[PDB]
């Protein structure tokens, strides 16, 4: 009945002009050395994590339309195995949104 989102989120290592310098692991090629890389960010654009580590506010998202949050769990975990997505599986009962943190 309800629509479920899944956000695939690059983890950020960071450390006031609102700018934060941060590093994260990008892809391309589809199996490099997994490249650590340095980009500039806007501090209000990253949300914290239980460590200092951050995720961006918005991410690349996939939406399913499940029968229940249970079935949506499978669908996403399957979708993630299918594309190279492994990380922290957290979920919100108000966003109906699964966030995965990669890197």
């Amino acid at each position, epitope marked *: 009945m309800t629509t479920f989102k899944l956000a695939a989120c690059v983890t950020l290592n960071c450390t006031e002009t609102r700018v934060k310098h941060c590093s994260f692991n990008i892809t391309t090629d589809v199996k490099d050395r997994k490249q650590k890389v340095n980009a500039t960010f806007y501090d209000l*654009d990253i949300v914290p994590l239980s460590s200092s580590l951050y995720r961006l506010i918005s991410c690349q998202t996939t939406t399913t339309e499940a029968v229940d949050a249970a079935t949506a769990a499978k669908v996403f975990k399957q979708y993630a195995n299918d594309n190279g997505i492994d990380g922290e599986w957290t979920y919100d009962d*108000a966003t109906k949104t699964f966030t995965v943190t990669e890197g």
Partner: antibody
Amino acid sequence: QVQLQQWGPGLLKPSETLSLTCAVYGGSFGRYYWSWIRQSSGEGLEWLGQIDHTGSTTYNPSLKGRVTISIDSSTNQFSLKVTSVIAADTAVYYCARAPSGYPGVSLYQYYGLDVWGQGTTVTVSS
Amino acid sequence: DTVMTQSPATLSVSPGERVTLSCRASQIINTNLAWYQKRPGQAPRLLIYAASARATGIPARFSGSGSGTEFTLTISGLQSEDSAVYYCQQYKHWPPYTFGRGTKL
């Protein structure tokens, strides 16, 4: 770290000119929208306008040309100035800060009104 | 001129519970939606910005979701201090950033 403190009239008469002044303690103007918002006594929030360290302004058209803001680089204050006051202008007036992102780097160009002054009640009557 | 339209107006509903506050942009506003809480002898304070991100400070028990045209702030693990008014502001189309006429808690 940011203190917002406003002050001014509170009573004035139709046709005249409202003037209010917010002063910012603990930080400066740096690429923030310095804004002005009001709420009529039992009413809705209404956005008046905003100014940034430039001098660039944007007022609410639905107030015709009556509203005007300015900013005072030296003292770290900025100020509302409403012209031709009438009874509907009776409202609480707040100064507030909104951050405006960073050209290139930032996802958005407006984050909330994150910082609000205590409020100034302004009653218009004879 | 986007017109913001909250719906429940009042909700004096019981503590501990899950509440769903709505907000409805008359136009598509992407995710430029912030949520403000208004306490008694207090000005508004910022809850959620960017449609979904919690403002620095405000506790994780607040949840703002939505995009496009229907949005939602959502609270469940109520503390005592939580009675207040809850306003929503659109910031995609401007001049007039425009607020909703609120929800009384």
